[PDB]
Subunit: 452 residues, 4 copies
């Protein structure tokens, strides 16, 4: 039915099949579908996730209007997601005023002030990171990074999102690790969205119950044992209250949505970085020299000395341009609206193809090359903040951005203070993106790790 | 799941069964369930249509807040209804700004000015009403009113909602009558609301297609033949334009929702009136004398002489108190709100039990008796407009109220100018309400019709 | 998922899309899809109605095995159909032993003995047929046949399937006609077969209730008024009893399934015949001369004189080859089986493309031409009864075949005894088949009717 | 709808609620619902799982007819179960001829001949059982049996169902243990059975994919490494072939269904036994003396010496009467049939309430007491094999019964050769059954373990 919408508005796009819409075209991945539509149709285009019209926009004014100017009034929420259960109280999933409240209640937790108090927690698990790596480096065996890096990203989440301290790699049998390790079906979510409500009254939760049952009680253990500078405690202090306080269940739901947002992003960006540092050894040396300058004698990184490292920042940012691991941003259009000369009707999903804008030859020279100088203070100013959006933009951007950048930077400083990384015969050169759902390598990153 | 809500808020009500909620209790009808809960639980109570929490309110302040003060801000829409298809553009079904627009676009059509121009159309089909009745009165055979009255209510709808002129009783084979006569499943709508969206992508429309296909083309015939003072023409003139104009499809959807709202209401109220006039012959005589006074020599009623008839008005109103044929009013609570001292959480349905307030001994003496003096100018002032609500109240009340009152009044004046109505041995005394869905008699009204 | 089946077996066919299978290819109609697959892939091919594998077979041995030899053992039922409700007791819909019983209980009703007793009923409504036609022939106005023919097919069904006698064209307001005239959504039945069971527990019946409620009571009126040689009475006599008797509800369900099978088939074949007789006037004259020979002085047809008419038989049969209005036959494969050298796995639907075999140049010379001599006693023997199957074949073939042939033949004899039929400027020459579901003309048949 | 069935047949039972049927009555558990209906309604009764009629039968003749005489003809399959995916090829889930084949293909694997070859595998993991227990016995800490016993039941399954050898308690990090440890929602399966097919086309498998993906490949590793006397190898030898061979996928599906059937049954019976041996210390001593007699000097048990132990057999059997952990047996009635004087219509589920027959005072004196002498050779003969059915009866009974009895007996001999078991203050005396789904203790069994 609703497949006639874009034709009437005169918006171009690929013709949709009945029921499926355009979803068959996701067979080369979201990344390649988006690049092709940018190429074929120019500045705007429309496709259909099943019956759901999606309008893609690439003009930086329009993007600003949607992400900033008309965020509260028109473009407040992302695509409706389910079946969720009580996770409807997670900030990323909540809508309209419930989100606005949740955002207000959680924002003091992610300030640079609070982030400086967490850096000694984040630091200690970098030590754990190196001593897991040195065990594989002294054994002359090429390293699968996602395992040592995956363990780091999960380690930092426990101790910051619940206060629990695990060497998940070597304390694998902690009751905590096993439950938090319970991190395809979502294509049917789309040809058959009418089925989400079925599952909701069936208590078929996308977040399994035993885990959510554990953390609820496990936080209700810690809440009633203190009664530490982790997200848990910063949230327990906020509900010691303007809007209402954060109910016990809501504080759990936020913790869980942090784990999810933080775990595989941090792991994948870190792997993407080390792949680039190994295939661009010059960039690696220059970074190691900066780390040794700011931190002589392999001094431990601190909040302030991290923010001192400009090339490290340049490497991280250039990597997040190549691999914006969320790939897209979305907002549901909640009202009939006109923006920067374009009528947009109610219920359309508006989408910003980050990946494709990050690799748009119209804004970047040699967009496939890993050139960190792009982000040099001399050249950084000629970058558009609505073209480069690895963490989104506007009131609903990534609230954990500052933390995620410190966290990865702390990982890298220490791992580069100790090791060098070289391609193995088993390294996938060139790295190929997973034609599948999330932004991750086809083949995992394997490299030789030697000890300075 | 959501069956714990009212307990937490400390709102009383009948305990719900899983999945079903309280729906098993509708076995004696909505009317008796509501009276019992008013009796058992006082001024507010909560029940569950399956999983859907419904909060009943009976304080006239609170009712005013919900229906008037916080209508636009909080309580704007009725229970979500489907699967509807294109009838999503009908004003009664549209929500929020789309409704606000539609209401603005249609309101000039229902003014007392426009109503006076339609009274000669409505009048001519009263003539048809009498000559169908005189045929059954000259044949010494007790009359089933819903047939002669049903034919009247449908007759007035055609000529006012599309311009077509049919003696539906004696021109039964008109292509128009057969399609418009395509006026249980809605209990499953409620234990299984998750199934509405299934039907929507299945084009399973609650309003069958051929009819809606006919009127679309049939209005697109009349629109392109004129290019008359019916609702159709008053709507064709409005789209000759503040909001946007009323799209061709939208004008059809309004016409259809008028037929629906107008047909069985007008038929049932008229039957309820004649049942009361026959079991209260004094009231009938006194009305016939008023009709003969204002209209000597059986003069034809006009707009102004109808508004002159105060007892006729008193009869109609007293009847609509006994039989408020919509029974309830509803608004979905769109925000967490507090009203007249009571927190009401988002997504609750708020409900005003009209029938039960209309028969609440706390506001009416002998509420079961048919006493039209209740509405005497002497006594009319001591009536609360939020207790007596046969047409609702506030910005979303019955937009066709003035028309519906003229229409029934025009029916009655003429039918009483000519006939008297007496109970037959087959009359159901006392009339019993249909324990089933809509407000209508168990047994249809049969009476003896004699000719003055 | 199940889209890999035919590849493994090495059966050719069009590649299916996910979820949809091959259904997009029905856009030129079942008839053209089948002819193309016969052309492209030879003697067997496979396609998918959504996830449902369908195997097409065209070898007359194989067809015999499926329709006859292994009917009871393997290929007993047609595609599961719903949501049906109590019509699960109709013989066409019942499965396995319940069907075998029903077939036994109903078979004496369709004998040539019983058919001769019904011919005077069928005859009288042919008279009604002519006098509806003569009214349009004396008015110099081209005739839409499906209206006069549709009225005939429905007339004969009432009086034979319930005993009721209506000139439906001129007694349109009979309570009986209106309910029996309550004779697209079935494509979703197939991409979403998982939804039939939903509707079943929702009492969403494909046969609406009021009709089925009427006939149940209306037969329970006639059953309790007699307690006539119609199907109703022949069924009331059978339940006056080997298997069990035919429950009251079952007798209704059979009556309804007869109406359905008999109404639009008889109407459409009759229209196809008259279209061919008008575009082949030679064939019409030769038939009129045979009718006048056997029946001199426009003598009324009888059972025996109908069976005397060999060219009339030749015309009817040749027409049913051109337009086999069921188009296909189907059986679900209930066991893993091998037949005439071919493994066929459980749950596959096996399909005989009648239309396409009826127009297969490999068995018919000039298959598009209307050549009734094909069925001449000289040439009739060289016809394969598993290639020509307008009524199916084997234990589950059309049980009402003998009746349907008499019925149409009786229509034609009388209408040709009185009128000649000539193409009008508004006749669609050449007739185009409806690219839509059932086998019927794109445009309805309009012709000039003159009076001998 | 179908809630009228038992009334018509004159079968008594609890009146069902719409949609839910009788399921609300499962709130005290299946065990108590069944005992109450046996008490209230006598020898047969009917209830409804939602719309699904279930007929309970308790006459031992009738039970024999259903389980034996008419197994192949009428009562072949259990309740249809889903959504399953490829596990449709598991023998317990397969139906009719596909089951009959699978049963034939797997039956040589469960002979007493093959069982004697596996006893040295089963034995070695009893050693592992004791040395896990001795660690908790030397630490003066009451033992949670389900952990040490759960680890035993899973240990024996790996090495016999795939050949893999793990001390799951102390090798917890084996890639094999973690995947095999991926062993509520099924009440909705029943009010909404119409939803199983939805999930099937959604690939929503009740057996998660990664596990089933692992074992498929992991067996395809072992199959292609040998190419040992485990079930895997005995099945690899069978497909080296009457029916067809066991496809690669089918052999996996059987292995998985063995794990499921074998894991929690063996763990729970073993816990039930040790609870009874600790609350009946006399029975424990008498068993320990028999074990020491047959096996002097704590000799290791063998196949033959296990079958020598008559009291050990008496203890096990008496326990399985108290706690028949499947609780019920079921067969779908596939045909209208009459059995031992009782019409049973097609599609009814027929159910044998094992638990309730095992505790029926009409067949057992003091049925709540743990009296192993019931099974003494003197008294064993007066036991009805259709009243006592811990493993079912007839062609579809528990195919792994002989193995399950050896397995538990081997556990017990060794654990009693070494330890004595005494109630702790934390022991739940009397043990209460879990009012929830499967037959297991409310509270897990904790006891003091001392070392002989
Ligand atoms: C390198 C790591 C990460 C990347 C690349 C990333 C990316 C993103 C993006 C692109 C968005 C959507 C922005 C928008 O819609 O405009 C987002 C949202 C969000 N992220 Fe991050 N993210 C990362 C790590 C984290 C971490 C560590 C947290 C820890 C708390 C976090 C918490 C959130 C939340 C709560 C939201 C939704 C905010 C809202 O809905 O108001 N993310 N992330
Ligand atoms: C005696 C006859 C009638 C009665 C007792 C009646 C009663 C009602 C009631 C109780 C409501 C809801 C009010 C609320 O929610 O506050 C309503 C709404 C409505 N009625 Fe009437 N009605 C009658 C006839 C008519 C007629 C003749 C029309 C012709 C146009 C009509 C058009 C509508 C519409 C469009 C609405 C919804 C308005 C909106 O959603 O904004 N009704 N009616
Ligand atoms: C010219 C008119 C008709 C045509 C072309 C036609 C065609 C067919 C065909 C092709 C089948 C399926 C045969 C098979 O699957 O092998 C069938 C089945 C059937 N027909 Fe006819 N039909 C006609 C009229 C009628 C009439 C008048 C009746 C009146 C009783 C009737 C009753 C049935 C029944 C009950 C079945 C299913 C039999 C069973 O399932 O055992 N049909 N028809
Ligand atoms: C003490 C342990 C066990 C108990 C109490 C138990 C009980 C049962 C029962 C009551 C049945 C249904 C019988 C019927 O419907 O008549 C059954 C079926 C079955 N069991 Fe066991 N079981 C146990 C262990 C095992 C084990 C260790 C296996 C290992 C292979 C196994 C394999 C099966 C299979 C395949 C079926 C279904 C047979 C078929 O459908 O043909 N079970 N079990
Ligand atoms: C769970 C949170 C949501 C709904 C999906 C996310 O998180 C994941 O994708 C986790 S993927 C995984 N599952 N299991 C394992 N090991 N990894 C995304 C994609 C990502 C973190 C970036 C943030 C954001 C919003 C914009 C997005 O695009 C998503 C969050 C906040 C979303 O609200
Ligand atoms: C209702 C009966 C069924 C299920 C469909 C039929 O009947 C129709 O198609 C009626 S179509 C219609 N609907 N409304 C109006 N006015 N016409 C078919 C197609 C046809 C009669 C030939 C017989 C058979 C079996 C083989 C078929 O192919 C069908 C019957 C017996 C089927 O069991």
């Amino acid at each position: 039915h609703s497949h006639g919408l874009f034709k009437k508005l005169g918006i171009p796009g690929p013709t949709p099949l009945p029921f499926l819409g355009n979803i068959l075209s996701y067979h080369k991945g979201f990344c390649m579908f988006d690049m092709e539509c940018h190429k074929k149709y120019g500045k705007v285009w429309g496709f259909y996730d099943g019956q759901q019209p999606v309008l893609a926009i690439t003009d930086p004014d329009m993007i600003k209007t949607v992400l900033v100017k008309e965020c509260y009034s028109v473009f407040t929420n992302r695509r409706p997601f389910g079946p969720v259960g009580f996770m409807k109280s997670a900030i990323s999933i909540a809508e309209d005023e419930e989100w606005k409240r949740l955002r207000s209640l959680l924002s003091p937790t992610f300030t640079s002030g609070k982030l400086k108090e967490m850096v000694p927690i984040i630091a200690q698990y970098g030590d754990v990171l190196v001593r897991n790596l040195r065990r594989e480096a002294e054994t002359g065996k090429p390293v699968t990074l996602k395992d040592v890096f995956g363990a780091y990203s999960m380690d930092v989440i426990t101790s910051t999102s619940f206060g629990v301290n695990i060497d998940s790699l070597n304390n694998p049998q902690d009751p905590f690790v096993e439950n938090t390790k319970k991190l395809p079906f979502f294509l049917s979510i789309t040809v058959f969205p009418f089925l989400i409500p079925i599952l909701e009254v069936l208590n078929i939760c996308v977040f399994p119950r035993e885990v959510t049952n554990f953390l609820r009680k496990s936080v209700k253990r810690m809440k009633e044992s203190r009664l530490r500078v982790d997200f848990l405690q910063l949230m327990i202090d906020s509900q010691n209250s303007s809007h209402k306080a954060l109910s016990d269940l809501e504080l759990v739901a936020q913790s869980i949505i942090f784990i999810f947002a933080g775990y595989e992003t941090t792991s994948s960006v870190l792997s993407f970085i080390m792949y680039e540092l190994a295939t661009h050894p010059d960039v690696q040396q220059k970074l190691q020299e900066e780390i040794d300058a700011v931190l002589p004698n392999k001094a431990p990184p601190t909040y302030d000395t991290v923010l001192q490292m400009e090339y490290l920042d340049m490497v991280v940012n250039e990597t997040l341009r190549l691999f914006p691991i969320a790939m897209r941003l979305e907002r549901v259009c909640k009202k009939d609206v006109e923006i920067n000369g374009m009528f947009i009707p109610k219920g359309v999903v508006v989408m910003i193809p980050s990946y494709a804008l990050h690799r748009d030859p119209k804004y970047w020279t040699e967009p496939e090359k890993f050139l960190p100088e792009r982000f040099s203070k001399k050249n950084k100013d000629n970058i558009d903040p609505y073209i480069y959006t690895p963490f989104g933009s506007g009131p609903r951007n990534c609230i954990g951005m500052r933390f995620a950048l410190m966290n990865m930077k702390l990982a890298l400083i220490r791992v580069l203070q100790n090791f060098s990384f070289k391609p193995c015969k088993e390294t996938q050169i060139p790295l190929k993106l997973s034609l599948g759902g999330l932004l991750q390598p086809e083949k995992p990153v394997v490299l030789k790790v030697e000890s300075r």
